[PDB]
Design a protein around this ligand. Structure first.
Ligand SMILES: CCCCCCCC/C=C\CCCCCCCC(=O)O[C@H](COC(=O)CCCCCCCCCCCCCCC)COP(=O)(O)OCCN
Ligand SMILES: CCCCCCCC/C=C\CCCCCCCC(=O)O[C@H](COC(=O)CCCCCCCCCCCCCCC)COP(=O)(O)OCCN
Ligand SMILES: CCCCCCCC/C=C\CCCCCCCC(=O)O[C@H](COC(=O)CCCCCCCCCCCCCCC)COP(=O)(O)OCCN
Ligand SMILES: CCCCCCCC/C=C\CCCCCCCC(=O)O[C@H](COC(=O)CCCCCCCCCCCCCCC)COP(=O)(O)OCCN
Ligand SMILES: CCCCCCCC/C=C\CCCCCCCC(=O)O[C@H](COC(=O)CCCCCCCCCCCCCCC)COP(=O)(O)OCCN
Ligand SMILES: CCCCCCCC/C=C\CCCCCCCC(=O)O[C@H](COC(=O)CCCCCCCCCCCCCCC)COP(=O)(O)OCCN
Ligand SMILES: CCCCCCCC/C=C\CCCCCCCC(=O)O[C@H](COC(=O)CCCCCCCCCCCCCCC)COP(=O)(O)OCCN
Ligand SMILES: *[C@@H]1O[C@H](CO)[C@@H](O[C@@H]2O[C@H](CO)[C@@H](O[C@@H]3O[C@H](CO)[C@@H](O)[C@H](O)[C@@H]3O)[C@H](O)[C@H]2NC(C)=O)[C@H](O)[C@H]1NC(C)=O
Ligand SMILES: COCC(CCO[C@H]1CC[C@@]2(C)C(=CC[C@H]3[C@@H]4C[C@@H]5O[C@]6(CC[C@@H](C)CO6)[C@@H](C)[C@@H]5[C@@]4(C)CC[C@@H]32)C1)COC
Ligand SMILES: COCC(CCO[C@H]1CC[C@@]2(C)C(=CC[C@H]3[C@@H]4C[C@@H]5O[C@]6(CC[C@@H](C)CO6)[C@@H](C)[C@@H]5[C@@]4(C)CC[C@@H]32)C1)COC
Ligand SMILES: COCC(CCO[C@H]1CC[C@@]2(C)C(=CC[C@H]3[C@@H]4C[C@@H]5O[C@]6(CC[C@@H](C)CO6)[C@@H](C)[C@@H]5[C@@]4(C)CC[C@@H]32)C1)COC
Ligand SMILES: COCC(CCO[C@H]1CC[C@@]2(C)C(=CC[C@H]3[C@@H]4C[C@@H]5O[C@]6(CC[C@@H](C)CO6)[C@@H](C)[C@@H]5[C@@]4(C)CC[C@@H]32)C1)COC
Ligand SMILES: *[C@@H]1O[C@H](CO)[C@@H](O[C@@H]2O[C@H](CO)[C@@H](O)[C@H](O)[C@H]2NC(C)=O)[C@H](O)[C@H]1NC(C)=O
Ligand SMILES: *[C@@H]1O[C@H](CO)[C@@H](O[C@@H]2O[C@H](CO)[C@@H](O)[C@H](O)[C@H]2NC(C)=O)[C@H](O)[C@H]1NC(C)=O
Ligand SMILES: *[C@@H]1O[C@H](CO)[C@@H](O)[C@H](O)[C@H]1NC(C)=O
Ligand SMILES: *[C@H]1O[C@H](CO)[C@@H](O)[C@H](O)[C@H]1NC(C)=O
Length: 1126
């Protein structure tokens, strides 16, 4: 039997039955509300498992042998789940927690598979390599959280109410804090949205109207999970701004409490926190992964007829024509839209039949004329014939979905689309089994939530979904829980974590959402990166001499730089309040006139200097000429008529003025040279994404076109009734007796391949799919009003799309950028781009500053008692003792909140005095270390300066007490304390390498972000002239706008992080009533509170693509310096 035990164990069929058993148990777990019948079934499963529990142990047939077998980690899962089932069969008390653990039986899928255990053993390796990075990011987030703790102590909590605190209640009258927190029906709701509008003391925060007073005292943050006080909450908020998830909303709320200035903080953070930390995580994961992969019916009749048709075969000569016919098929299907003319659609079906007959006849002749057995052989022609069969099925909704599948043969004449095909192959091939891990992991968490939250999801529903109904993302089902796990895999958690916490409870909801975020994102990361790696007279001459001496000299250069900077500032003063001061209005008029004159002058000078050949040889000189010609047209239209009708068309192009800056600056021009190097590598990938999105957009047209339109009667703004009030756009007309009802399509939808491309961008950017998916699935019929969830499985479209549309397209994109950039490092005269000659020098000097072989250790004082001082000092003990002292200081610095209690205030002040006393003592002992500690190590000058500064703090506090009290400066006075903790960089060597690498790569990053600043400038003035007077919508508030240049710069800043651009686009794209009405009374001549959809999409899409290219360049600079460190 023991012999029989083994000879059944190694038997393969036994393990395959095990695997199928596991999967069936899985499907029988996934159910919610399990019928009681099914209940008996689970008994059986236990038996099955337990029976092997026999075989496994019985293959050992011995005590020590069976314990050696259990000694394996994977079989521990079997032992545990089987004994759990046994004890549950024995006795129940049962709080239903025991019903959840049955999910881990899924992990047995890992150790039954020959590679799953291998892959998951591979994963834990990269996370252990991620050790130093994890330490740096937690310390960095703690530092920034202390910054934000002292900066925004309860600062978020400010709200606007009606006026209170009137007179002699003594405080209990409104018409103390009790009724004030009871007030929220008094809170000033952010118009058109569900939000209490913040405010602040500063003359920058969100300002309330008449009838409202602004006071910090508020009930709570948005749901208590945002706030910056209570350092744990600040750690959460800075976690999200490290992940940038919904970071725009916290950005808005902060800058509507505190004031716009503090945005510096955010960009600092978003330059350090999100950007840099995430990029390092990327770098280390990729490095460890590449390492791991490196470690790895008559005779003459038959003859004559075969040879006649062979003579036919002698000239196919239709392949390019057939390819054009395929492209014409795709086009013919593409000229499809919402309201198609009758005879139009008749012709379209006509051509449908045309193309079908064409390809069907072609295949019918080819398969018979070349070889039936060969067309049995080559699978390519086989799949062509498959699509033939599918066309036949259509001819003799979804019936169209296959007609597209031919475009892919282009991949043989088009190599990079073959590369996309190889990529999606590796998504199932080389690393494809890795993807199974993802599956399983999703499958685990996909259910681990519902049984923990779904029941709760099912009952406090009024807490999580305001519109009384199921929420848009619940977990009660298993589809919806797959969608939550998916969205979280898409880096968008906290906006559903607030839900999960507001239903059930903080502890477990955290433990599961942080778990899914970290775990699943690490897996998605390893997959992403595995893909990226598997993708691998004489007076004439005299005057000319004067001219060279003029223009080549530093004085003219610096003067022209001063001119161009003043012209850029001129542009910057094109705000909407020019009318507010008349003087500046003619001031800038004369300014512009001087600019035109000096620039045409220097144009002439360059002309005679180089002559037209060397002049128009330069592209930058070409650009300068184009701009100056625009200015010439402008000035002549000013002087000699011909204006005010239609160069008011060429009027705004003046905003491109700063485009002259790139030529003369040493840092912009070089990275711009780099980007023109990326156009030959981005055009092809743009075209690949163009085709590979045209497919999906056609598909969404077939399934979707027209169905999106629903919107509303002008009463509310939210989609109409499915019960109904209206089902039909031809049934709302019977109610349009009053125009209050509007049947409008959603601002971005599938009515073309154009708006299809737009909705596909908004989806695969993840910022603004909400209305897309919602009004996509909810829709049922071609013009049937969307029933609240019907056709619900159409999420499967986006999901499928999203995978490609993000994890391959973007993937492939990044791919070609690397090699190109990689190849750019080869033939370039240098090894790393983005560094000027002087910047190369500076980087080499900064690196030589990284000397690890030290100098002479220390001069002994020879003073006996100073010898004892030395004997206690230069040892490692005193250092780590001081280190624990500074860490206890750290925790002293974490505990504080706002308005804690006066006793706590005094206690913490006294503890600060205690610690600074400690540090003065250490400072005097250090200045007397031997003699020279004040200059032997910069790590000691740091301690000296922080001691003196700490002393300055206490004295400053005393001065504030005795002579005067300031308001926010007081806060800075109490602020520099964080510097103390920074010594850890002295202790920490890993962080001392990482932030050092950041310093190393700060030059190239300065250049790239400088170009970024210039582009923000161009676009911000571009909008200030173009995007003015737009209506307020959800993304475009009162403060983040385009009215001035500051607000424009703040908006375009957030959009520099590809965030919010949905919410800023939606107020632009809109056209016509109700929201947009007779254009506007504008102080400017340009009328309209409305946006221009053409140029709106142009502006925002182009900013996204450009800024995204600059940002990828930033990322690659970071990573290349990272590798050059090691
Ligand atoms: C790309 C992968 C997409 C996978 C989506 C699978 C959806 C399966 C599904 O909806 O069945 C759901 C259950 O699926 C399973 O039980 C596990 C299937 C594996 C039923 O959900 P319902 O709303 O209660 O009806
Ligand atoms: C790994 C993470 C382990 C998570 C265990 C945290 C325990 C959660 C319990 C908890 O509620 O902590 C509360 C604070 O928790 C939070 O606010 C969020 C904490 C987020 C930590 C994020 C860690 C990221 C890991 C990297 C206690 O603070 P409170 O202000 O007194 O709130 C009381 C009632 N609102
Ligand atoms: C690994 C082990 C980590 C253990 C984490 C269990 C911690 C559960 C904390 C807890 O209290 O769960 C409470 C309910 O406990 C449960 O639901 C049982 C959950 C069993 C854990 C399932 C194991 C998951 C395995 C993956 C809910 O928290 P709360 O008391 O409502 O907090 C409200 C405070 N405002
Ligand atoms: C090395 C190159 C340094 C580049 C220096 C200046 C680039 C020209 C940027 C235009 C200055 C904007 C002036 C302006 O907006 O005035 C209107 C005032 O704007 C403000 O108050 C915000 C200040 C924005 C500073 C942007 C740098
Ligand atoms: C490269 C991408 C630049 C995209 C700008 C070209 C379309 C400009 C907006 C436009 O012409 O649509 C005008 C009216 O707007 C529409 O309804 C058509 C929507 C077409 C949006 C095409 C967006 C392309 C997105 C590129 C994805 C890569 C015509
Ligand atoms: C080690 C000693 C920790 C001393 C903690 C004393 C408890 C102070 C109250 C407290 O935990 O503050 C709460 C937050 O305090 C903390 O965050 C301490 C967390 C220590 C993180 C170090 C783990 C690595 C909120 O108030
Ligand atoms: C090195 C630097 C490289 C620079 C490269 C290209 C520079 C691009 C220059 C075009 C940018 C400006 C285009 C533009 O604004 O035309 C706007 C186009 O107007 C439209 O309706 C767009 C029609 C959609 C056609 C799609 C393609 C747009 C054509 C431009 C390219 C007109 O603006 P506006 O409505 O007159 O605003 C006046 C309010 N005061
Ligand atoms: C911006 O900060 C100012 C502080 O200058 C806030 O005004 C002050 O608000 C407090 C209440 O929160 C007032 O205190 C009250 O006055 C009596 C006077 O005897 C005081 O004894 C009590 O403590 C009582 O709470 C304080 O008088 C008031 N200052 C003035 C001159 O009205 C202001 O509310 C802040 N703005 C916002 C947006 O809340
Ligand atoms: C309140 O009104 C304004 C006050 C100044 C403020 C906060 C405003 C917007 C632009 C802001 C600037 C964008 C610039 O962009 C940067 C970033 C990159 C730098 C290299 C160049 O300038 C900021 C320093 C510059 C800036 C962040 C500094 C602060 C500016 C609002
Ligand atoms: C602005 O005002 C709009 C309003 C309503 C207009 O009705 C629409 C009817 C269909 C029409 C003419 C328009 C939009 C998409 C259009 C398509 C975008 C496709 O994409 C292309 C271009 C990109 C290529 C990669 C693929 O094919 C076009 C050939 C394809 C197209 C231009 C063909 C014609 C389509 C207008 C009036
Ligand atoms: C290799 C080099 C690139 C090249 C010429 C190859 C053949 C197909 C080519 C494509 C056909 C597509 O046809 C188009 C035209 C219609 C567009 C809507 C998208 O697809 C080109 C962009 C697309 C294309 C012209 C771009 C370039 C491709 C050979
Ligand atoms: C019923 C109503 C249609 C519906 C919701 C259901 C099943 C298939 C679903 C489709 C698979 C199609 O194919 C998809 C997914 C599979 C991909 C191969 C191609 O595109 C979806 C666009 C298409 C789909 C996801 C859209 C919605 C379809 C249920
Ligand atoms: C348009 O909406 C109307 C009202 O919802 C529907 O028109 C029909 O509704 C009546 C009432 O039940 C039925 O008797 C007819 O049979 C319906 N028409 C058809 C063609 O079945 C219907 O929902 C929509 N009809 C059209 C043509 O769009
Ligand atoms: C019902 O009909 C009225 C009259 O057309 C609609 O009101 C106008 O809708 C158009 C749509 O572009 C706008 O251009 C006009 O500005 C609207 N007029 C107003 C009120 O100023 C109304 O929208 C229609 N409602 C339905 C049934 O969709
Ligand atoms: C909010 O909207 C109302 C609607 O008329 C408007 O009057 C008010 O100025 C707006 N205020 C803010 C802060 O958006
Ligand atoms: C509210 O009323 C008080 C007292 O009249 C006034 O000082 C304050 O400016 C008002 N604020 C509002 C309603 O904007």
């Amino acid at each position: 039997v023991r012999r029989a035990a083994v000879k059944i164990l190694v038997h393969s069929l036994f393990s395959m039955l095990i695997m199928c058993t596991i999967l069936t148990n899985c499907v029988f777990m996934a159910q919610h509300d399990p019928p009681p019948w099914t209940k008996y079934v689970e008994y059986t499963f236990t038996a099955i498992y337990t029976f092997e529990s026999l075989v496994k142990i019985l293959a050992r047939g011995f005590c020590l042998h069976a314990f050696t077998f259990l000694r394996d980690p994977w079989n521990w899962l079997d032992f545990s789940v089987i004994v759990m089932a046994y004890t549950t069969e024995f006795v129940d008390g049962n709080v239903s927690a025991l019903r959840t653990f049955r999910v881990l039986r899924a992990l047995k899928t890992i150790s039954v598979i020959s590679g799953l255990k291998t892959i998951v053993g591979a994963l834990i390796q990269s996370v252990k390599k991620l050790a130093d990075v994890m330490v740096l990011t937690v310390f960095c987030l703690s530092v920034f959280a202390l910054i934000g703790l002292q900066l925004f102590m309860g600062n978020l909590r400010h709200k606007c109410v009606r006026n209170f605190t009137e007179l002699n209640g003594n405080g209990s009258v409104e018409a103390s804090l009790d009724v004030y927190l009871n007030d929220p029906a008094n809170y000033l709701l952010k118009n058109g949205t569900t939000d209490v509008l913040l405010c602040g003391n500063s003359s920058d925060a969100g300002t309330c109207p008449e009838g409202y007073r602004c006071l910090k005292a508020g009930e709570n943050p948005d749901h208590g999970y945002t706030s910056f006080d209570s350092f744990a909450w600040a750690f959460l908020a800075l976690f999200r701004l490290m992940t940038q998830d919904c970071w725009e909303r916290l950005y808005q709320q902060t800058l509507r409490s505190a004031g716009k200035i503090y945005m510096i903080f955010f960009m600092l953070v978003i330059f350090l926190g999100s950007f840099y930390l995430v990029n390092l995580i990327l770098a280390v994961v990729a490095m460890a992964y590449e390492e791991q992969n490196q470690a790895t019916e008559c005779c003459p009749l038959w003859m004559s007829i075969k040879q006649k048709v062979k003579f036919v075969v002698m000239d196919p000569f239709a392949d390019l024509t057939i390819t054009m016919c395929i492209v014409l098929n795709t086009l013919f299907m593409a000229l499809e839209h919402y309201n198609m003319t009758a005879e139009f659609e008749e012709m379209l079906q006509v051509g449908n039949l045309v193309f079908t007959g064409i390809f069907t006849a072609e295949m019918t002749f080819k398969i018979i004329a070349l070889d039936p057995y060969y067309y049995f052989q080559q699978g390519w022609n086989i799949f062509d014939s498959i699509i033939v069969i599918l066309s036949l099925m259509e001819l003799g909704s979804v019936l169209r979905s296959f007609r597209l599948l031919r475009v892919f043969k282009l991949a043989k004449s088009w190599p990079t689309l073959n590369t996309l095909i190889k990529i999606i192959g590796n998504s199932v091939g080389a690393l494809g089994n890795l993807t199974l891990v993802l599956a399983i992991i999703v499958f685990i968490f996909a259910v681990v939530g519902m049984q923990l939250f779904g029941k709760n999801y099912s009952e406090l529903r009024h807490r999580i979904s305001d519109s009384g109904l199921l929420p848009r993302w619940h977990m009660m089902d298993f589809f919806h829980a797959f969608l939550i796990i998916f969205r979280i895999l898409c880096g968008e958690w906290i906006e559903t974590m607030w839900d999960c916490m507001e239903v059930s409870g903080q502890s477990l909801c955290l433990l599961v959402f942080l778990l899914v975020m970290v775990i699943g994102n690490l897996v998605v990361l390893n997959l992403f990166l595995a893909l990226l790696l598997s993708s691998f007279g004489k007076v004439w001459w005299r005057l000319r001499k004067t001219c060279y001496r003029i223009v080549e000299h530093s004085w003219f250069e610096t003067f022209i730089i001063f001119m161009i900077l003043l012209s850029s500032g001129a542009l910057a003063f094109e705000d909407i309040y020019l009318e507010e001061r008349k003087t500046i209005k003619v001031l800038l008029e004369y300014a512009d006139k001087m600019f035109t004159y000096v620039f045409v002058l220097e144009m002439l000078l360059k002309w005679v200097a180089y002559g037209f050949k060397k002049y128009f040889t330069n592209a930058w000189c070409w650009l300068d000429f184009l701009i100056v010609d625009v200015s010439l047209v402008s000035l002549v239209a000013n002087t000699l008529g011909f204006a005010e009708m239609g160069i008011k068309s060429l009027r705004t192009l003046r905003a491109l003025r700063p485009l002259r800056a790139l030529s003369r600056f040493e840092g912009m021009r070089v990275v711009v040279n780099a980007l023109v190097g990326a156009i030959p590598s981005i055009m092809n990938v743009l075209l690949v994404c163009l085709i590979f999105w045209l497919i999906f957009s056609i598909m969404g047209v077939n399934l979707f076109a027209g169905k999106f339109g629903r919107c509303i009667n002008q009463t509310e703004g939210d989609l109409p009734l499915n019960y109904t009030i209206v089902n039909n756009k031809s049934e709302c007309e019977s109610f349009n007796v009053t125009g209050e009802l509007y049947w409008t399509k959603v601002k971005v939808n599938f009515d073309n391949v154009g708006a299809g491309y737009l909705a596909l961008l908004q989806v695969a950017t993840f910022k603004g799919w909400m209305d897309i998916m919602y009004a996509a699935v909810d829709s049922r019929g071609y013009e049937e009003q969307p029933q609240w969830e019907d056709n619900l499985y159409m999420y499967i479209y986006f999901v499928v799309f999203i995978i490609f549309g993000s994890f391959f397209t973007l993937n492939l994109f990044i791919g070609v950028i690397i090699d190109n950039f990689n190849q750019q490092k080869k033939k370039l005269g240098g090894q790393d781009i983005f560094m000027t000659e002087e910047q190369k020098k500076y980087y080499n000097a900064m690196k030589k500053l990284g000397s690890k072989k030290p100098q002479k250790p220390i001069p002994r004082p020879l003073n006996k008692y100073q010898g004892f001082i030395f004997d206690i000092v230069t040892k490692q003990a005193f250092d780590v003792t001081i280190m624990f002292l500074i860490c206890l200081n750290m925790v002293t610095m974490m505990v504080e909140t706002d308005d804690q209690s006066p006793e706590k205030v005094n206690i913490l002040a006294k503890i600060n005095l205690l610690f600074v006393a400690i540090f003065t003592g250490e400072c005097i002992v250090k200045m007397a270390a031997l003699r020279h500690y004040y200059f032997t190590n910069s790590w000691n000058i740091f301690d000296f300066v922080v001691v003196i500064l700490s002393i300055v703090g206490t004295v400053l506090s005393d001065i504030i007490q005795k002579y005067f009290f300031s308001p926010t400066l007081f806060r800075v006075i109490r602020l520099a304390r964080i510097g103390r903790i920074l010594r850890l960089i002295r202790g920490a060597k890993g962080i001392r390498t990482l932030l050092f690498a950041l310093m190393m790569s700060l030059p190239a990053l300065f250049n790239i972000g400088l170009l970024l600043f210039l582009v923000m400038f161009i676009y911000s003035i571009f909008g200030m002239a173009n995007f003015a007077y737009v209506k307020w919508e959800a993304g475009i508030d009162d403060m983040f706008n385009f009215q001035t240049f500051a607000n424009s710069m703040l908006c375009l800043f957030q959009i520099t992080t590809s965030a919010g651009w949905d919410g800023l686009l939606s107020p632009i794209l809109n056209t016509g009533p109700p929201y947009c009405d007779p254009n506007l009374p504008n102080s400017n001549g340009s009328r309209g509170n409305c946006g221009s959809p053409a140029v709106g999409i142009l502006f925002f899409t182009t900013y996204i693509i450009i800024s995204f290219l600059i940002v990828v360049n930033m990322y690659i600079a970071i990573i290349l310096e990272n590798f050059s460190v090691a």
